[PDB]
């Protein structure tokens, strides 16, 4: 399947290495949260290149994650309940965060924001991890009609 990962030790093996062990299909390569890039460079310099890219990419991920929590905490998320006799029917799912993201325009993925499938009424708050160097909080409010 794959011989490379996008991340170092997170919960098991298969680090950001030129060669990594594998046991069948995995999200170790499928998820955009943790992928692999084509090797296409491996004579001797590839391992140093991957190591240096690992440190640099971790640092830049941390910087952009700080900016993204700031920008997403500043903004507000509001929707409307199309309700009958005060009974909530509106769907509150990853759709909404994807909509508000595409209005803002940052690259995400729908399995990356894992959000509980349920309904909601009134103001409520959610705590979620975006990447493995991240911990964020987002707010949702709704108006009745």
């Amino acid at each position: 399947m794959k011989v490379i990962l996008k991340q170092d030790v997170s919960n098991l093996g298969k680090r950001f290495d030129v060669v990594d062990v594998k046991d069948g299909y995995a999200i170790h390569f499928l998820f955009p949260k943790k992928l692999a890039a084509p090797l296409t460079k491996k004579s001797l310099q590839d391992r140093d290149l991957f190591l240096k890219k690992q440190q640099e990419h971790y640092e830049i991920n941390k910087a952009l994650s700080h900016k993204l929590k700031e920008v997403i905490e500043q903004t507000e998320l509001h929707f409307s309940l199309k309700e009958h006799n005060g009974r909530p029917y509106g769907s509150i799912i990853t759709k909404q965060i994807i909509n508000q993201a595409h209005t803002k325009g940052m690259a995400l993925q729908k399995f990356m924001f894992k959000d509980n499938v349920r309904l909601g009424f009134g103001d409520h708050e959610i705590t979620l991890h975006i990447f493995e160097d991240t911990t964020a909080v987002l707010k949702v409010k709704v108006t009745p009609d």
Binding site: K2, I4, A36, A37, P38, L39, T40
Partner: protein
């Protein structure tokens, strides 16, 4: 056409038995796998691919 688009491999018509004095014919249906494809623009979802082609994609890291 029971085959993928990126590679052209036609199902071969052959024979079948473990025991007989006569001869018969059957085909070999090439195994086809619906998998997401990878490109920088647009369409990236289900396309049918061959298993050996899949394995080549895995070692070539075509995502």
């Amino acid at each position: 056409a029971k085959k993928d688009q990126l590679t052209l491999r036609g199902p071969l018509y052959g024979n079948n038995r473990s025991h007989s004095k006569t001869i018969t014919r059957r085909k070999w249906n090439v195994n086809l796998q619906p998998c997401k494809v990878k490109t920088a623009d647009g369409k990236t979802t289900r396309i049918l691919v061959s298993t050996r082609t899949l394995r080549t994609l895995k070692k070539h890291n075509r995502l």
